[PDB]
Amino acid sequence: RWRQTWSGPGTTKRFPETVLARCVKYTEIHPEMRHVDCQSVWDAFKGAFISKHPCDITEEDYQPLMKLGTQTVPCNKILLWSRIKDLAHQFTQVQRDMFTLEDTLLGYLADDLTWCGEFDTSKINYQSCPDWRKDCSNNPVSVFWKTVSRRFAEAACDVVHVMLDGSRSKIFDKDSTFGSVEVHNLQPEKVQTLEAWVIHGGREDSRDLCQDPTIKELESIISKRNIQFSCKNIYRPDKFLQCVKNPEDSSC
Numbered sequence: 001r002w003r004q005t006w007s008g009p010g011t012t013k014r015f016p017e018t019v020l021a022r023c024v025k026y027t028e029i030h031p032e033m034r035h036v037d038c039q040s041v042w043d044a045f046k047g048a049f050i051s052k053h054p055c056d057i058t059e060e061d062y063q064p065l066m067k068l069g070t071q072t073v074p075c076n077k078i079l080l081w082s083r084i085k086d087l088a089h090q091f092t093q094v095q096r097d098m099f100t101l102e103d104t105l106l107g108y109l110a111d112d113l114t115w116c117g118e119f120d121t122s123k124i125n126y127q128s129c130p131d132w133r134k135d136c137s138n139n140p141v142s143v144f145w146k147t148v149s150r151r152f153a154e155a156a157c158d159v160v161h162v163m164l165d166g167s168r169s170k171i172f173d174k175d176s177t178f179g180s181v182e183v184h185n186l187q188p189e190k191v192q193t194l195e196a197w198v199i200h201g202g203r204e205d206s207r208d209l210c211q212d213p214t215i216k217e218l219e220s221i222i223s224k225r226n227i228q229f230s231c232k233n234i235y236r237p238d239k240f241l242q243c244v245k246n247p248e249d250s251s252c
């Protein structure tokens, strides 16, 4: 068909099979999730968006799935990220120094996937799904991430870290999930500090990007929530990862 209902990519091929298989793998690997019934998880995930208008999804739609995906995360070891998920993930993969959202069952189930249904049919839409900008923000994927990211941020305590992409024109972006949801849902009663790691993309010698106006904005916002702010440059992410794998080892 030469045209489609929405402007975004349609549901990821074999979405039901993919989510199911991810749930099985996760609960097989992660002991604490060992009892989880992956069929019930799939059904609850389905229940959030099937037969529903994909511009009319709410956080409530995802509550059955949230309940089933309830999981304790070590509160002082949370790593948030904005844009640069590959480094964040490569980092936590070394020795589980920290946990990102994609290390939780629910984040793992949905990572890199697109999905939506149709009002008044039970069909998954494999042709297109709403674009957040062009179509609607209350779509199944955007609403899912907002809901799960809020919960993840509320679970954090002590020092919370965030990797930010220093090669972007807005290192801290208030419109991102990190900036619009996570920063506002850290609980000042529990969270002592937010420490930003600003990942350089520019090769070799570069600025102190902790002085970037958007970082100063982030500092102001966090400080005004009664949370301390710290910032560090990571000048060579490749060296950084090497030092994580082999610390004190070289020129670290």
Ligand SMILES: Nc1nc(O[C@@H]2O[C@H](COP(=O)(O)O)[C@@H](O)[C@H]2O)c2ncn([C@@H]3O[C@H](COP(=O)(O)OP(=O)(O)OP(=O)(O)O)[C@@H](O)[C@H]3O)c2n1
Binding pocket: 079, 080, 081, 082, 083, 084, 085, 100, 101, 102, 111, 112, 113, 131, 132, 133, 134, 141, 142, 145, 146, 149, 152, 175, 176, 177, 178, 179, 182
């Ligand atoms: N794996 C993952 N984790 C998310 O969430 C937490 O959110 C943070 C990262 O999101 P951020 O980069 O937006 O801050 C991390 O701290 C995680 O703890 C996501 N929050 C949103 N997404 C999804 O990432 C995909 C690309 O989004 P984009 O931010 O690159 O571009 P977008 O804002 O959707 O462009 P638009 O068309 O103008 O709306 C979309 O599927 C979007 O729904 C997400 N994907």
